[PDB]
Design a protein around this ligand. Structure first.
Ligand code: HEC
Ligand code: HEC
Lengths: 126, 126
Protein backbone atom coordinates (compact mmCIF):
# COMPACT_ATOMS: atom_id res chain seq x y z
CA UNK A 1 0.00 0.00 0.00
CA UNK A 2 3.04 2.29 -0.13
CA UNK A 3 3.98 4.33 -3.19
CA UNK A 4 7.61 4.76 -2.06
CA UNK A 5 9.78 3.28 0.71
CA UNK A 6 9.37 6.51 2.68
CA UNK A 7 5.65 5.86 2.90
CA UNK A 8 6.29 2.49 4.53
CA UNK A 9 8.68 4.17 6.96
CA UNK A 10 6.08 6.81 7.87
CA UNK A 11 3.43 4.12 8.34
CA UNK A 12 5.47 1.86 10.58
CA UNK A 13 6.73 4.79 12.70
CA UNK A 14 3.12 5.88 13.22
CA UNK A 15 1.98 2.37 14.02
CA UNK A 16 4.79 1.93 16.53
CA UNK A 17 4.03 5.34 18.09
CA UNK A 18 0.36 4.40 18.56
CA UNK A 19 1.44 0.73 20.01
CA UNK A 20 3.74 2.45 22.32
CA UNK A 21 1.08 4.84 23.65
CA UNK A 22 -1.47 2.05 24.19
CA UNK A 23 1.15 -0.04 25.97
CA UNK A 24 2.87 2.66 27.99
CA UNK A 25 -0.38 4.33 29.18
CA UNK A 26 -0.97 1.23 31.34
CA UNK A 27 2.29 1.60 33.26
CA UNK A 28 0.64 3.64 36.13
CA UNK A 29 -2.08 0.99 36.37
CA UNK A 30 0.42 -1.91 36.52
CA UNK A 31 2.35 -0.04 39.18
CA UNK A 32 -0.80 0.73 41.23
CA UNK A 33 -0.32 4.50 40.84
CA UNK A 34 -3.62 4.72 38.93
CA UNK A 35 -6.75 2.67 39.62
CA UNK A 36 -7.39 -0.69 37.94
CA UNK A 37 -10.69 -0.72 36.03
CA UNK A 38 -10.85 -4.14 34.40
CA UNK A 39 -13.24 -3.08 31.65
CA UNK A 40 -11.05 -0.05 30.82
CA UNK A 41 -7.93 -2.21 30.49
CA UNK A 42 -9.78 -4.93 28.53
CA UNK A 43 -10.88 -2.36 25.98
CA UNK A 44 -7.40 -0.78 25.81
CA UNK A 45 -5.69 -4.13 25.31
CA UNK A 46 -8.12 -4.89 22.47
CA UNK A 47 -6.90 -1.68 20.80
CA UNK A 48 -3.28 -2.68 21.49
CA UNK A 49 -3.92 -6.14 19.99
CA UNK A 50 -5.05 -4.57 16.72
CA UNK A 51 -2.18 -2.09 16.62
CA UNK A 52 0.48 -4.69 17.46
CA UNK A 53 -0.25 -6.62 14.25
CA UNK A 54 0.28 -3.55 12.02
CA UNK A 55 3.93 -2.49 11.88
CA UNK A 56 5.38 -5.65 10.43
CA UNK A 57 3.81 -5.47 6.97
CA UNK A 58 5.47 -2.08 6.53
CA UNK A 59 8.98 -3.57 6.68
CA UNK A 60 8.51 -5.16 3.25
CA UNK A 61 11.69 -5.86 1.25
CA UNK A 62 13.62 -2.81 0.12
CA UNK A 63 11.99 -0.55 2.83
CA UNK A 64 15.25 0.18 4.49
CA UNK A 65 14.97 3.59 6.03
CA UNK A 66 14.05 5.36 9.24
CA UNK A 67 15.64 3.83 12.34
CA UNK A 68 15.28 0.28 11.00
CA UNK A 69 18.51 -1.76 10.90
CA UNK A 70 19.30 -3.53 7.54
CA UNK A 71 19.51 -6.82 9.41
CA UNK A 72 15.76 -6.77 9.62
CA UNK A 73 15.85 -7.85 5.93
CA UNK A 74 18.93 -9.96 5.65
CA UNK A 75 17.90 -11.87 8.78
CA UNK A 76 14.21 -12.22 7.85
CA UNK A 77 13.44 -15.43 9.81
CA UNK A 78 15.02 -14.02 12.98
CA UNK A 79 13.23 -10.66 12.75
CA UNK A 80 10.02 -12.71 12.18
CA UNK A 81 10.91 -14.66 15.41
CA UNK A 82 11.03 -11.43 17.39
CA UNK A 83 7.78 -10.02 15.98
CA UNK A 84 5.94 -13.30 16.43
CA UNK A 85 7.21 -13.69 20.02
CA UNK A 86 6.07 -10.12 20.72
CA UNK A 87 2.57 -10.93 19.37
CA UNK A 88 2.22 -14.16 21.36
CA UNK A 89 3.10 -12.09 24.39
CA UNK A 90 0.34 -9.68 23.32
CA UNK A 91 -1.98 -12.75 23.23
CA UNK A 92 -1.03 -13.46 26.86
CA UNK A 93 -1.67 -9.83 27.80
CA UNK A 94 -5.13 -10.05 26.15
CA UNK A 95 -5.88 -13.19 28.15
CA UNK A 96 -4.89 -11.43 31.40
CA UNK A 97 -6.95 -8.34 30.56
CA UNK A 98 -9.96 -10.44 29.50
CA UNK A 99 -9.71 -12.31 32.83
CA UNK A 100 -9.71 -9.04 34.82
CA UNK A 101 -6.74 -10.27 36.85
CA UNK A 102 -4.35 -7.50 37.97
CA UNK A 103 -1.54 -9.92 38.98
CA UNK A 104 -1.79 -11.73 35.64
CA UNK A 105 -1.85 -8.33 33.93
CA UNK A 106 1.33 -7.11 35.63
CA UNK A 107 3.25 -10.28 34.75
CA UNK A 108 2.06 -10.27 31.11
CA UNK A 109 2.80 -6.56 30.76
CA UNK A 110 6.39 -7.15 31.90
CA UNK A 111 6.74 -9.97 29.32
CA UNK A 112 5.50 -7.69 26.57
CA UNK A 113 7.87 -4.92 27.58
CA UNK A 114 10.82 -7.38 27.51
CA UNK A 115 9.84 -8.40 24.01
CA UNK A 116 9.71 -4.73 22.90
CA UNK A 117 13.23 -4.27 24.30
CA UNK A 118 14.57 -7.47 22.70
CA UNK A 119 13.58 -6.37 19.20
CA UNK A 120 14.75 -2.82 19.93
CA UNK A 121 18.20 -3.95 20.94
CA UNK A 122 18.61 -6.18 17.84
CA UNK A 123 16.85 -4.22 15.12
CA UNK A 124 16.52 -0.52 15.91
CA UNK A 125 19.47 1.68 14.94
CA UNK A 126 21.30 3.29 17.88
CA UNK B 1 -2.27 9.45 28.47
CA UNK B 2 -0.14 12.37 27.28
CA UNK B 3 2.55 14.00 29.42
CA UNK B 4 2.54 17.22 27.36
CA UNK B 5 0.35 18.67 24.60
CA UNK B 6 3.01 17.72 22.05
CA UNK B 7 2.48 14.07 22.92
CA UNK B 8 -1.22 14.37 22.07
CA UNK B 9 -0.28 16.04 18.79
CA UNK B 10 2.16 13.24 17.92
CA UNK B 11 -0.46 10.61 18.80
CA UNK B 12 -3.28 12.09 16.75
CA UNK B 13 -1.00 12.72 13.73
CA UNK B 14 0.06 9.07 13.86
CA UNK B 15 -3.49 7.85 14.26
CA UNK B 16 -4.64 9.96 11.33
CA UNK B 17 -1.69 8.76 9.21
CA UNK B 18 -2.57 5.12 9.90
CA UNK B 19 -6.52 5.89 9.18
CA UNK B 20 -5.52 7.51 6.02
CA UNK B 21 -3.42 4.54 4.84
CA UNK B 22 -6.15 2.01 5.65
CA UNK B 23 -8.72 4.14 3.86
CA UNK B 24 -6.66 5.25 0.87
CA UNK B 25 -5.20 1.77 0.13
CA UNK B 26 -8.72 0.74 -0.98
CA UNK B 27 -8.96 3.41 -3.66
CA UNK B 28 -7.62 1.06 -6.45
CA UNK B 29 -10.14 -1.57 -5.36
CA UNK B 30 -13.08 0.87 -5.40
CA UNK B 31 -11.99 2.05 -8.83
CA UNK B 32 -11.63 -1.53 -10.17
CA UNK B 33 -7.90 -1.06 -10.85
CA UNK B 34 -7.09 -3.78 -8.30
CA UNK B 35 -9.12 -6.93 -7.68
CA UNK B 36 -11.94 -7.07 -5.11
CA UNK B 37 -11.37 -9.79 -2.51
CA UNK B 38 -14.28 -9.47 -0.10
CA UNK B 39 -12.48 -11.13 2.80
CA UNK B 40 -9.42 -8.87 2.30
CA UNK B 41 -11.56 -5.71 2.38
CA UNK B 42 -13.65 -6.96 5.34
CA UNK B 43 -10.49 -7.45 7.37
CA UNK B 44 -9.05 -4.08 6.29
CA UNK B 45 -12.24 -2.22 7.16
CA UNK B 46 -12.19 -3.86 10.61
CA UNK B 47 -8.72 -2.33 11.08
CA UNK B 48 -10.00 1.03 9.79
CA UNK B 49 -12.96 0.85 12.21
CA UNK B 50 -10.59 0.53 15.17
CA UNK B 51 -8.28 3.28 13.95
CA UNK B 52 -11.10 5.70 13.15
CA UNK B 53 -12.16 5.83 16.81
CA UNK B 54 -8.66 6.83 18.02
CA UNK B 55 -7.75 10.38 16.99
CA UNK B 56 -10.51 12.22 18.77
CA UNK B 57 -9.43 11.54 22.36
CA UNK B 58 -6.10 13.18 21.52
CA UNK B 59 -7.72 16.58 20.90
CA UNK B 60 -8.40 17.01 24.61
CA UNK B 61 -8.72 20.60 25.89
CA UNK B 62 -5.56 22.68 25.72
CA UNK B 63 -3.97 20.38 23.02
CA UNK B 64 -3.80 23.11 20.48
CA UNK B 65 -0.86 22.38 18.27
CA UNK B 66 0.10 20.66 15.05
CA UNK B 67 -2.20 21.47 12.13
CA UNK B 68 -5.30 21.53 14.35
CA UNK B 69 -7.38 24.73 14.16
CA UNK B 70 -8.30 26.36 17.55
CA UNK B 71 -11.96 26.18 16.56
CA UNK B 72 -11.81 22.50 17.27
CA UNK B 73 -11.95 23.52 20.97
CA UNK B 74 -14.05 26.62 21.00
CA UNK B 75 -16.63 24.89 18.79
CA UNK B 76 -16.60 21.55 20.65
CA UNK B 77 -20.15 20.40 19.80
CA UNK B 78 -19.63 21.12 16.09
CA UNK B 79 -16.24 19.36 15.92
CA UNK B 80 -17.96 16.44 17.74
CA UNK B 81 -20.68 16.54 14.98
CA UNK B 82 -18.04 16.10 12.29
CA UNK B 83 -16.19 13.27 14.06
CA UNK B 84 -19.41 11.45 14.90
CA UNK B 85 -20.72 11.80 11.32
CA UNK B 86 -17.39 10.45 10.06
CA UNK B 87 -17.70 7.40 12.39
CA UNK B 88 -21.31 6.65 11.41
CA UNK B 89 -20.07 6.70 7.84
CA UNK B 90 -17.37 4.24 8.92
CA UNK B 91 -20.23 2.08 10.33
CA UNK B 92 -21.85 2.12 6.87
CA UNK B 93 -18.54 1.19 5.25
CA UNK B 94 -18.20 -1.75 7.69
CA UNK B 95 -21.71 -2.90 6.79
CA UNK B 96 -20.84 -2.78 3.05
CA UNK B 97 -17.55 -4.65 3.59
CA UNK B 98 -19.22 -7.25 5.84
CA UNK B 99 -21.85 -7.79 3.11
CA UNK B 100 -19.17 -8.35 0.44
CA UNK B 101 -20.98 -5.95 -1.89
CA UNK B 102 -18.66 -3.97 -4.20
CA UNK B 103 -21.36 -1.45 -5.24
CA UNK B 104 -22.29 -0.82 -1.61
CA UNK B 105 -18.57 -0.54 -0.83
CA UNK B 106 -17.93 2.09 -3.50
CA UNK B 107 -20.86 4.24 -2.36
CA UNK B 108 -19.92 3.99 1.34
CA UNK B 109 -16.27 4.72 0.57
CA UNK B 110 -17.26 7.92 -1.23
CA UNK B 111 -19.38 8.97 1.80
CA UNK B 112 -16.44 8.39 4.12
CA UNK B 113 -14.11 10.38 1.90
CA UNK B 114 -16.58 13.31 1.86
CA UNK B 115 -16.67 13.24 5.63
CA UNK B 116 -12.84 13.31 5.79
CA UNK B 117 -12.88 16.36 3.51
CA UNK B 118 -15.64 18.12 5.47
CA UNK B 119 -13.68 18.00 8.72
CA UNK B 120 -10.47 18.88 6.87
CA UNK B 121 -11.95 22.00 5.36
CA UNK B 122 -13.36 23.21 8.72
CA UNK B 123 -10.73 22.13 11.21
CA UNK B 124 -7.33 21.53 9.64
CA UNK B 125 -5.07 24.58 9.28
CA UNK B 126 -4.31 25.59 5.68
C1 HEC C 1 10.58 -5.81 16.35
C2 HEC C 1 9.94 -7.18 16.24
C3 HEC C 1 9.98 -4.76 17.26
C4 HEC C 1 9.11 -4.92 18.34
C5 HEC C 1 8.55 -6.19 18.90
C6 HEC C 1 8.86 -3.62 18.80
N1 HEC C 1 9.52 -2.65 18.10
FE1 HEC C 1 9.68 -0.70 18.46
N2 HEC C 1 10.57 -0.43 16.71
C7 HEC C 1 11.15 -1.41 15.94
C8 HEC C 1 11.88 -0.89 14.86
C9 HEC C 1 12.65 -1.67 13.82
C10 HEC C 1 11.73 0.48 14.93
C11 HEC C 1 12.29 1.49 13.95
C12 HEC C 1 11.25 1.76 12.85
C13 HEC C 1 11.72 2.76 11.79
O1 HEC C 1 11.71 2.44 10.58
O2 HEC C 1 12.11 3.90 12.22
C14 HEC C 1 10.95 0.72 16.08
C15 HEC C 1 10.55 1.98 16.52
C16 HEC C 1 9.81 2.26 17.68
C17 HEC C 1 9.43 3.55 18.09
C18 HEC C 1 9.69 4.86 17.37
C19 HEC C 1 8.69 5.05 16.23
C20 HEC C 1 8.82 6.42 15.59
O3 HEC C 1 7.94 7.29 15.80
O4 HEC C 1 9.81 6.66 14.88
C21 HEC C 1 8.76 3.38 19.30
C22 HEC C 1 8.14 4.44 20.19
C23 HEC C 1 8.77 1.99 19.54
N3 HEC C 1 9.40 1.28 18.55
C24 HEC C 1 8.22 1.41 20.69
C25 HEC C 1 7.99 0.04 20.88
C26 HEC C 1 7.25 -0.50 21.94
C27 HEC C 1 6.68 0.25 23.11
C28 HEC C 1 7.15 -1.88 21.72
C29 HEC C 1 6.44 -2.95 22.48
C30 HEC C 1 5.02 -2.52 22.94
C31 HEC C 1 7.87 -2.09 20.50
N4 HEC C 1 8.36 -0.91 20.00
C32 HEC C 1 8.05 -3.36 19.91
C33 HEC C 1 11.05 -2.80 16.20
C34 HEC C 1 10.22 -3.39 17.16
C1 HEC D 1 -12.32 15.79 11.99
C2 HEC D 1 -13.59 15.23 12.59
C3 HEC D 1 -11.50 14.96 11.03
C4 HEC D 1 -11.88 13.86 10.26
C5 HEC D 1 -13.23 13.21 10.19
C6 HEC D 1 -10.73 13.47 9.57
N1 HEC D 1 -9.65 14.26 9.82
FE1 HEC D 1 -7.85 14.28 8.97
N2 HEC D 1 -7.20 15.57 10.32
C7 HEC D 1 -7.98 16.35 11.14
C8 HEC D 1 -7.25 17.31 11.86
C9 HEC D 1 -7.78 18.33 12.84
C10 HEC D 1 -5.92 17.12 11.48
C11 HEC D 1 -4.73 17.88 12.01
C12 HEC D 1 -4.15 17.13 13.24
C13 HEC D 1 -2.94 17.82 13.87
O1 HEC D 1 -2.96 18.12 15.09
O2 HEC D 1 -1.97 18.07 13.09
C14 HEC D 1 -5.94 16.07 10.54
C15 HEC D 1 -4.82 15.55 9.91
C16 HEC D 1 -4.80 14.54 8.94
C17 HEC D 1 -3.64 14.03 8.33
C18 HEC D 1 -2.20 14.43 8.61
C19 HEC D 1 -1.70 13.75 9.88
C20 HEC D 1 -0.22 13.99 10.11
O3 HEC D 1 0.61 13.07 9.92
O4 HEC D 1 0.15 15.13 10.48
C21 HEC D 1 -4.07 13.09 7.40
C22 HEC D 1 -3.23 12.24 6.45
C23 HEC D 1 -5.48 13.07 7.51
N3 HEC D 1 -5.95 13.94 8.47
C24 HEC D 1 -6.30 12.27 6.71
C25 HEC D 1 -7.67 12.03 6.93
C26 HEC D 1 -8.42 11.06 6.25
C27 HEC D 1 -7.96 10.21 5.11
C28 HEC D 1 -9.69 11.05 6.83
C29 HEC D 1 -10.89 10.20 6.55
C30 HEC D 1 -10.53 8.70 6.36
C31 HEC D 1 -9.62 12.05 7.84
N4 HEC D 1 -8.38 12.63 7.90
C32 HEC D 1 -10.71 12.40 8.67
C33 HEC D 1 -9.38 16.21 11.27
C34 HEC D 1 -10.16 15.19 10.72
Amino acid sequence: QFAKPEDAVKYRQSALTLMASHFGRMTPVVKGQAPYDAAQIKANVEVLKTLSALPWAAFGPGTEGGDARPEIWSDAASFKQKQQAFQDNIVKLSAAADAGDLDKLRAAFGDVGASCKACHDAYRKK
